[PDB]
Amino acid sequence: GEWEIIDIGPFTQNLGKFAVDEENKIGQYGRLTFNKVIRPCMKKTIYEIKGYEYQLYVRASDKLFRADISEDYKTRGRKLLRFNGPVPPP
Amino acid sequence: GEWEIIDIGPFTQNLGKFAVDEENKIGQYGRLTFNKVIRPCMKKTIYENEGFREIKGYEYQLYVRASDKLFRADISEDYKTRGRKLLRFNGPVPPP
């Protein structure tokens, strides 16, 4: 596992939207409206690379949540691993 | 507030010792034996930007292994006073 901080550009905002979409299907937090992914955004590269994990602070419905997203290198499948909160801002 | 990942040498391990020593003083857990601060460790540099710019202090987000479990500890330090404070200590958490 190697870690880096990545920026919060539209590619990163997409992962936030994915987190919210997936959590909305699960329904534990009710109906969330995605607002924004905030800093800091972290990315772990899992090793030859197997895939990645992104740790995000996602603001949905004016609340902040922690979402972890896994991404497989070969298949490019993504999965929401964790989604909890509300948490205070970092 | 600029963030960076910091390495896990003695300064970092002693932030981890701080966190464990403080938590043990609180006593809500059974006695925690400090093992190690693991990667990643994040450092937030807190700047004052209005007027003469300067670094006021730092906040650190740590993963600390203690009694073979992992905990999350956030620590702030004021540079001028050397005031180090345990902002939060939660756990056990799953590994990053």
Swiss-Prot record, chain A:
A Pfam family it matches: Monellin
Alphabetized Gene3D superfamilies for the sequence: 6.10.140.2000
Site annotation Blocking, abolishes the sweet taste: residues: C41
Biotechnological exploitation: Natural monellin has not been mass marketed to the food industry, primarily due to the challenge of large-scale purification of the protein which is relatively sensitive to heat or acid treatment.
UniProtKB keywords: Taste-modifying protein
Record's function text: Taste-modifying protein; intensely sweet-tasting protein.
Quaternary assembly: Heterodimer of an A chain and a B chain.
Protein's name in the database: Monellin chain B
Protein source organism: Dioscoreophyllum cumminsii
